[PDB]
Design a protein around this ligand. Sequence first.
Ligand SMILES: NS(=O)(=O)c1ccc(O)c(NC(=O)NCCCCO)c1
Ligand SMILES: [Zn+2]
Length: 257
Amino acid sequence: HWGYGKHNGPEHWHKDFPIAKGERQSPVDIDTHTAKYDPSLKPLSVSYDQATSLRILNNGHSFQVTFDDSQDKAVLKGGPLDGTYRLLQFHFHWGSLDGQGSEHTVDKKKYAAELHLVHWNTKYGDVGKAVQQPDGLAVLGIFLKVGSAKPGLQKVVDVLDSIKTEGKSADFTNFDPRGLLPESLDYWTYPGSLTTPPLAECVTWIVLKEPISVSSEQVLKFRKLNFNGEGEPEELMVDNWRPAQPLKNRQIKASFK
Ligand SMILES: NS(=O)(=O)c1ccc(O)c(NC(=O)NCCCCO)c1
Ligand SMILES: [Zn+2]
């Protein structure tokens, strides 16, 4: 089964998921001087006021917080998107050291971590159908740099000791994802894929220009999670990121000059 190690990591994934060598794979390097400002791009509309978080889970490749997506409670609209996209979950990718961990890069710069807020297009009825469509998902990506603490992250950080190993989950109600957003919603956008298997080419990526700052203590708690299940030899959950993939016949657009 796939992972991030020497023998099952990103360079091997194409054997079980041949789309890994496809025409619209993610992540990519964002060359800021080559991205084109698109004045027809609308501001992002993030409506998270009624979000209902449910659970937090260690799935063996990251940890994720899941939301009730059975109604339009937390939705993303506008920007490059047509229609309404419901928030399903968020998760992170991070490194073993502060100089790596993000999936997207900016002028080849890697951030310490990357937050992905995953949304699906309500016209397709459920996320399983949406993943089969070229415009099925919208992922909002937010970079994390290490500096001052992010208060809105602390409730996540403080529960991680209860989901140390693969398969563990915990109740995680009343979490407000608005506390994870930077001040500015300026963004880059391009058509891409899931960054983990099945690597489906169904994602409109929206990557925010402004990172959030988290403290060294906060990211250190991410690095104490385990890839392995309970009772197995311990392998710290670090460096769970896919490297940048070829841009091929794609242009990255910017919402800002
Ligand atoms: N990192 S991402 O591009 O935001 C992303 C967003 C939503 C997703 O569903 C996945 N992929 C996933 O969760 N795979 C789980 C194992 C099942 C494969 O058989 C990746
Ligand atoms: Zn992700």
